[PDB]
Motif scaffolding. Structure first.
Motif, mmCIF file in Angstrom:
data_model
loop_
_atom_site.group_PDB
_atom_site.id
_atom_site.type_symbol
_atom_site.label_atom_id
_atom_site.label_comp_id
_atom_site.label_asym_id
_atom_site.label_seq_id
_atom_site.Cartn_x
_atom_site.Cartn_y
_atom_site.Cartn_z
ATOM 1 N N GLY A 3 0.849 -1.111 -0.248
ATOM 2 C CA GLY A 3 0.118 -0.207 -0.060
ATOM 3 C C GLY A 3 0.830 1.439 0.185
ATOM 4 N N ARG A 4 0.218 2.157 -0.281
ATOM 5 C CA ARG A 4 0.812 3.477 -0.279
ATOM 6 C C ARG A 4 0.898 4.296 1.009
ATOM 7 N NH1 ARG A 4 -1.864 7.254 -4.961
ATOM 8 N NH2 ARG A 4 -3.685 6.245 -4.008
ATOM 9 N N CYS A 5 1.973 4.867 1.156
ATOM 10 C CA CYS A 5 2.127 5.682 2.678
ATOM 11 C C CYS A 5 3.377 6.706 2.248
ATOM 12 C CB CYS A 5 2.619 4.622 3.458
ATOM 13 S SG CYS A 5 4.460 3.903 3.207
ATOM 14 N N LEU A 6 2.898 7.793 3.366
ATOM 15 C CA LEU A 6 3.955 8.816 3.359
ATOM 16 C C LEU A 6 4.987 8.645 4.661
ATOM 17 C CD1 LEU A 6 1.681 11.751 2.997
ATOM 18 C CD2 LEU A 6 3.110 10.925 1.202
ATOM 19 N N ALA A 7 6.242 8.916 4.137
ATOM 20 C CA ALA A 7 7.398 8.640 5.292
ATOM 21 C C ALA A 7 8.331 9.763 5.549
ATOM 22 C CB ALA A 7 8.339 7.548 4.535
ATOM 23 N N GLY A 10 14.161 14.031 7.188
ATOM 24 C CA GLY A 10 14.143 15.360 7.683
ATOM 25 C C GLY A 10 12.831 15.847 7.790
ATOM 26 N N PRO A 11 12.776 17.220 7.639
ATOM 27 C CA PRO A 11 11.414 17.725 7.613
ATOM 28 C C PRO A 11 10.469 17.611 6.379
ATOM 29 C CG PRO A 11 12.954 19.358 6.931
ATOM 30 C CD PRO A 11 13.790 18.362 7.431
ATOM 31 N N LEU A 12 10.793 16.646 5.589
ATOM 32 C CA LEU A 12 9.840 16.658 4.287
ATOM 33 C C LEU A 12 9.389 15.334 4.441
ATOM 34 C CD1 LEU A 12 11.681 18.757 1.793
ATOM 35 C CD2 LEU A 12 9.819 19.457 3.187
ATOM 36 N N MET A 13 8.250 15.154 3.911
ATOM 37 C CA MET A 13 7.479 13.942 3.234
ATOM 38 C C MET A 13 7.696 13.342 1.913
ATOM 39 S SD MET A 13 5.996 12.479 5.522
ATOM 40 C CE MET A 13 5.843 13.011 7.195
ATOM 41 N N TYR A 14 7.797 12.215 1.748
ATOM 42 C CA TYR A 14 7.963 11.441 0.403
ATOM 43 C C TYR A 14 6.998 10.516 0.177
ATOM 44 C CZ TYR A 14 12.144 14.119 0.300
ATOM 45 O OH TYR A 14 13.194 15.410 -0.093
ATOM 46 N N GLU A 15 6.499 10.211 -0.950
ATOM 47 C CA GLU A 15 5.479 8.994 -1.056
ATOM 48 C C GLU A 15 6.169 7.721 -1.321
ATOM 49 O OE1 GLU A 15 3.464 6.619 -3.457
ATOM 50 O OE2 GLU A 15 2.913 6.602 -1.028
ATOM 51 N N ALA A 16 5.867 6.837 -0.763
ATOM 52 C CA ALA A 16 6.589 5.455 -0.717
ATOM 53 C C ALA A 16 5.516 4.447 -0.783
ATOM 54 C CB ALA A 16 7.511 5.214 0.535
ATOM 55 N N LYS A 17 5.911 3.007 -1.328
ATOM 56 C CA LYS A 17 5.326 1.936 -1.487
ATOM 57 C C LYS A 17 5.984 0.948 -0.379
ATOM 58 C CE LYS A 17 3.835 3.162 -5.971
ATOM 59 N NZ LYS A 17 4.185 4.631 -5.793
ATOM 60 N N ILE A 18 5.275 0.403 0.379
ATOM 61 C CA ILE A 18 5.560 -0.606 1.330
ATOM 62 C C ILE A 18 5.978 -2.057 0.647
ATOM 63 C CG2 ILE A 18 5.085 -1.880 3.562
ATOM 64 C CD1 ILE A 18 2.970 0.264 4.177
ATOM 65 N N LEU A 19 7.263 -2.548 1.066
ATOM 66 C CA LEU A 19 7.627 -3.749 0.261
ATOM 67 C C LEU A 19 7.682 -4.774 1.350
ATOM 68 C CD1 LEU A 19 10.585 -2.742 -2.181
ATOM 69 C CD2 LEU A 19 8.097 -2.457 -2.421
ATOM 70 N N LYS A 20 8.290 -4.387 2.635
ATOM 71 C CA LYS A 20 8.118 -5.501 3.601
ATOM 72 C C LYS A 20 7.707 -4.872 4.901
ATOM 73 C CE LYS A 20 12.506 -7.390 1.699
ATOM 74 N NZ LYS A 20 14.216 -7.284 2.115
ATOM 75 N N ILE A 21 7.057 -5.748 5.342
ATOM 76 C CA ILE A 21 6.502 -5.435 6.718
ATOM 77 C C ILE A 21 7.043 -6.309 7.978
ATOM 78 C CG2 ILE A 21 4.160 -5.221 8.170
ATOM 79 C CD1 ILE A 21 2.629 -4.827 5.799
ATOM 80 N N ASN A 66 -3.179 9.256 3.696
ATOM 81 C CA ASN A 66 -4.701 9.986 3.684
ATOM 82 C C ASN A 66 -4.760 11.368 3.334
ATOM 83 O OD1 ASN A 66 -3.330 10.964 6.024
ATOM 84 N ND2 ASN A 66 -4.565 9.915 7.446
ATOM 85 N N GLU A 67 -5.825 12.101 3.283
ATOM 86 C CA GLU A 67 -5.894 13.558 2.821
ATOM 87 C C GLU A 67 -4.961 14.479 4.113
ATOM 88 O OE1 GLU A 67 -9.927 14.989 2.476
ATOM 89 O OE2 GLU A 67 -9.223 16.569 1.064
ATOM 90 N N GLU A 68 -5.259 13.927 5.179
ATOM 91 C CA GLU A 68 -4.732 14.857 5.947
ATOM 92 C C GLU A 68 -2.670 14.931 5.962
ATOM 93 O OE1 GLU A 68 -5.690 13.690 10.327
ATOM 94 O OE2 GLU A 68 -4.624 15.494 11.226
ATOM 95 N N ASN A 69 -2.412 13.770 5.991
ATOM 96 C CA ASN A 69 -1.013 13.643 5.754
ATOM 97 C C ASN A 69 -0.671 14.122 4.370
ATOM 98 O OD1 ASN A 69 -0.546 12.536 8.251
ATOM 99 N ND2 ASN A 69 -0.990 10.424 7.355
ATOM 100 N N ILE A 70 -1.424 14.302 3.219
ATOM 101 C CA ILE A 70 -0.925 15.099 2.055
ATOM 102 C C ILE A 70 -0.960 16.257 2.406
ATOM 103 C CG2 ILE A 70 -1.689 15.147 -0.295
ATOM 104 C CD1 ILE A 70 -3.001 12.263 -0.248
ATOM 105 N N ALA A 71 -2.127 16.771 3.007
ATOM 106 C CA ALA A 71 -1.851 18.268 3.289
ATOM 107 C C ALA A 71 -0.930 18.954 3.981
ATOM 108 C CB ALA A 71 -3.278 18.690 3.728
ATOM 109 N N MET A 72 -0.323 18.175 5.128
ATOM 110 C CA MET A 72 0.585 18.213 5.788
ATOM 111 C C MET A 72 1.881 18.183 5.130
ATOM 112 S SD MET A 72 3.246 16.371 7.318
ATOM 113 C CE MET A 72 4.462 16.141 8.464
ATOM 114 N N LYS A 73 2.175 17.411 4.394
ATOM 115 C CA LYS A 73 3.412 17.283 3.244
ATOM 116 C C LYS A 73 3.341 18.380 2.641
ATOM 117 C CE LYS A 73 4.604 14.788 -0.961
ATOM 118 N NZ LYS A 73 4.595 13.687 -1.863
ATOM 119 N N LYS A 74 2.414 18.828 2.003
ATOM 120 C CA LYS A 74 2.184 20.299 1.282
ATOM 121 C C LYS A 74 2.612 21.396 2.122
ATOM 122 C CE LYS A 74 -1.194 18.593 -2.087
ATOM 123 N NZ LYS A 74 -2.738 18.631 -2.403
ATOM 124 N N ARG A 75 2.190 21.231 3.200
ATOM 125 C CA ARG A 75 2.409 22.527 4.216
ATOM 126 C C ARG A 75 3.785 22.566 4.627
ATOM 127 N NH1 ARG A 75 0.029 23.447 10.402
ATOM 128 N NH2 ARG A 75 1.627 25.215 11.011
#
Length: 96
Positions: A3-7, A10-21, A66-75
């Motif tokens: 699934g897609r996730c934000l990681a 530093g002080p910035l976000m980056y979209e990522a895909k989980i390969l191993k849990i 989710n929307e909240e984390n995407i908005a926080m990444k944009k901020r």
DNA sequence: AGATCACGCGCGATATCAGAATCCCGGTGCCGAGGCCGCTCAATTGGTCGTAGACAGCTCTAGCACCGCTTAAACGCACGTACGCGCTGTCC
């Protein structure tokens, strides 16, 4: 898994895909740094990047896609660029 | 006001921190190449006969050469304008 996730990096976000849990209880990963080996961490491949940047990240550095984390990444991006512009302006002002 | 020294900023070069792609080194399995065997067709040997080409003689056409005029064309010179080329900035 997958699934897609934000990681955090530093002080910035980056979209990522989980390969191993990673499940510390059973000592296995479904398809490691000691500071996160105890807890449930995840091996992630970042969107837009090479495989060389794949890494294990704990719960602290990850957030649900989710929307909240995407908005926080944009901020975070907006405040980062604002800070860079402010630093450049301060240097310019110091130069005269 | 000028010169020297120190600090700050800008530019160039090297290093480097990395990470990316390529080349290289090794093991491996493969199938494509080299080789041997057997068969036969095409090349070789021998001979003939005939005409194609080689050779000599002669002819005369065309190439070469020479001269002399006249005059079209090349060469030379000059002014200038417009085209080539460099620099720059923008947009895609």
């Amino acid at each position: 898994l997958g699934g897609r996730c934000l990681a955090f990096h530093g002080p910035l976000m980056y979209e990522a895909k989980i390969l191993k849990i990673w499940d510390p209880s059973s000592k296995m990963y479904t398809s490691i740094p000691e500071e996160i080996i105890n807890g449930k961490c995840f091996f992630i491949h970042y969107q837009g990047w090479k495989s060389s940047w794949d890494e294990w990240v704990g719960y602290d550095r990850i957030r649900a896609y989710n929307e909240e984390n995407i908005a926080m990444k944009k901020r975070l991006a907006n405040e980062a660029k604002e800070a860079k512009k402010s630093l450049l302006e301060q240097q310019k002002k110091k130069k005269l």
